[PDB]
């Protein structure tokens, strides 16, 4: 699809067999979900933004579908006021910014 | 262009005469720079991310080139990690997400 920037670009994921919405944010290195359970062993990590940092878990070799396209990488989990899919799956759906 | 997300997408803005890097933001309603100094009044703004809130100084109609590309609009001026060009100039300049 090509998504226009008039409003936000929320999409709807599926991850963990739960459907969530989320953000597709360019600007994010890492994709971040808000508190759900994930299978495997995780690590913990600290990550910023405006605002400054919370702390995660991070999970590796998650599938998400997003928007209907698969891909499979690192989630991290936590209090994020928002769920945002960032570039390390980005790239896996093949996204990009044209202007 | 065409801007794949392997990398961050940095690009080179121009404010106020000066070069700047900046990010190419998605998933920021809003376009925050690091403290410079702009023209003019300016209005109060709290902005929010990740990490919580911040506050930030507001300048309209403010003439910027965002990869070559004209914008005049709104910048956001406080204690961003980071310069972010968000959707209220990308709009400007005519960018989509596309895969
Ligand atoms: C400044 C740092 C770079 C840009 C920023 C954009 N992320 C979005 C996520 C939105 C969910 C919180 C954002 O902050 N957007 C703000 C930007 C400010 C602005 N005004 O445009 C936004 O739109 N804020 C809205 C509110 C969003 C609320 N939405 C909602 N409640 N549904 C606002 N009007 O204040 N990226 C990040 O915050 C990510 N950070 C990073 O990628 C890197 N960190 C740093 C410091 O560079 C990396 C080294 O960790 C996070 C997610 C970790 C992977």
Redo the contacts between chains.
């Keep these: ?6 409003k ?2 929320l999409v709807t994921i599926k991850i963990g067999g739960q459907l969530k919405e989320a ?7 890492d994709t ?1 979900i808000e508190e759900m359970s994930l299978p495997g062993r995780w690590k913990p990590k600290m ?8 702390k995660v878990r991070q999970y590796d070799q998650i599938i998400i579908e997003i ?1 209907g ?1 698969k891909a499979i990488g690192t989630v991290l989990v936590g209090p ?3 769920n ?1 899919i960032g ?1 390390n799956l ?2 896996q ?7």
């Design positions: 699809p090509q998504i226009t920037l008039w936000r670009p953000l597709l944010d360019t600007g994010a290195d971040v990550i910023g933004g405006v605002g400054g940092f919370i928007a396209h994020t006021p928002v945002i570039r980005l790239t759906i093949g996204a990009t910014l044209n202007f």
